[PDB]
Ligand binder design. Structure first.
Ligand SMILES: [Zn+2]
Length: 320
C-alpha cells in the first residue's frame, strides 16, 4: 500500500523516496526507469519496493548539480532520451573483425559504425564530460552500450532513423580535447580592413569541414568580407597529432599503390549506407558494419578522410 524506492541520476548517489499506490510514479515523483523500463505511468506496487530507479525529470537541486557536473549543460529531455536509447541499443552487438571491433548492422545504425571506428583511430583523445569519458573508456574495454547511447543522445539521434556519419562525428568531436597541443594559424587579409590572424587551438585545429585534401585545405581561400569587398584566408602554420577533413560525398578512385597520405576514410553509398575504410599494409580494409573485406582498389564516395599529424609552416608571404 506504500513503498520505498531509491532514486538516482548518476548510479552513485541515491535518495530514498516514499510512494503510495494512489497515483502513478509520474504524478508523485517523475519520469522513472526501472532497469531500462519506463515505469512512469505505472501505479507503484510491492514489487518495486527497495529497488533502484533512474529519474529523468523533477530533480532535486542536488541532482541537478550532479547532472550538470556529470553530463554537462544538457536540455531537460536529455536524461529521458538517454535512458530510452540505452535500453533500445542494449541488444546491439560489437563484432570482432580483423582484431578490430565494429558495430553490427541493425536499425539503420551503419552511420554509427563509421563514427565509432573513426574515433577508435584518433590517438589520445579524451572527453571533457565525465559521463562521456567513462563511457568511452568502458567502450574501449569491450562494453559499448553506454557510449553508443550517449553520443546518440548528445547528437539528437533517433533510434532506428538513418543519419549522417560526418554530422555525428563532428558533433561528438566538439565535446573532446587533446592530450598534446595543436595549432592552426589562418592569415586573413582585405585591401580595406587590413590583415588579421585567426588562431584555432586543440581539437578545433584537427577537424575541418569543407575540403577533403590537405592541398585544398592549405590553399588560398577567397570569400566576401564584412565590408563587402574581397577577403582572403590561408593557413600559414599547422601543427596537429592527426587531421580529420570532411566533405560531401565525393566520387574518387582510391588505390594502393601509390600510397595515399591518409590512413583511413569513410564512404557513403546511394536511404544510404556507410562504410569505414582503413589503409593497412598496402590494402584498403573495408569494414561494412560487422564485416571485413580487402581490395587494393576502390571506386567509392569518400566523406571523412583521416590524415596523420601535420607539421606545416608556410614559406610564403601569403599576403603578397
Ligand atoms: Zn574588408
Amino acid at each position: 500500500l506504500t513503498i520505498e524506492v531509491l532514486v538516482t541520476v548518476d548510479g552513485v548517489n541515491f535518495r530514498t523516496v516514499v510512494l503510495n499506490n494512489k497515483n502513478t510514479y509520474r504524478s508523485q515523483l517523475g519520469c522513472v526507469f526501472f532497469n531500462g523500463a519506463d515505469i512512469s505511468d505505472t501505479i507503484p506496487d510491492e514489487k518495486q519496493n527497495g529497488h533502484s530507479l533512474y529519474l529523468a525529470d523533477n530533480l532535486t537541486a542536488d541532482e541537478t548539480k550532479a547532472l550538470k557536473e556529470l553530463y554537462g549543460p544538457v536540455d531537460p529531455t536529455f536524461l529521458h532520451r538517454f535512458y530510452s536509447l540505452k535500453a533500445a541499443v542494449h541488444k546491439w552487438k560489437m563484432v570482432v573483425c580483423d582484431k578490430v571491433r565494429s558495430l553490427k548492422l541493425s536499425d539503420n545504425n551503419c552511420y554509427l559504425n563509421a563514427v565509432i571506428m573513426t574515433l577508435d583511430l584518433l590517438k589520445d583523445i579524451k572527453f571533457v564530460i565525465p559521463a562521456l569519458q567513462h563511457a568511452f573508456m568502458k567502450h574501449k574495454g569491450g562494453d559499448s552500450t553506454d557510449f553508443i547511447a550517449l553520443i546518440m543522445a548528445y547528437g539528437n539521434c533517433t533510434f532506428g532513423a538513418p543519419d549522417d556519419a560526418s554530422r555525428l562525428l563532428h558533433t561528438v568531436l566538439a565535446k573532446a580535447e587533446l592530450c598534446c597541443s595543436a595549432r592552426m594559424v589562418w592569415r586573413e587579409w582585405c585591401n580595406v580592413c587590413g590583415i588579421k590572424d585567426v588562431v584555432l587551438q586543440g581539437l578545433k585545429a584537427c577537424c575541418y569541414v569543407g575540403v577533403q585534401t590537405v592541398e585544398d585545405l592549405r590553399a588560398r581561400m577567397t570569400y566576401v568580407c564584412q565590408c563587402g569587398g574581397e577577403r582572403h584566408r590561408q593557413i600559414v602554420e599547422h601543427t596537429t597529432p592527426w587531421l580529420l577533413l570532411s566533405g560531401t560525398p565525393n566520387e574518387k578512385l582510391v588505390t594502393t599503390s601509390t600510397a595515399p597520405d591518409f590512413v583511413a576514410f569513410n564512404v557513403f553509398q546511394g536511404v544510404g549506407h556507410y562504410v569505414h575504410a582503413r589503409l593497412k599494409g598496402g590494402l584498403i580494409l573495408k569494414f561494412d558494419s560487422g564485416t571485413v573485406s580487402k581490395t587494393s582498389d576502390w571506386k567509392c564516395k569518400v566523406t571523412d578522410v583521416l590524415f596523420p599529424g601535420q607539421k606545416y609552416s608556410s614559406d610564403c608571404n601569403v599576403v603578397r
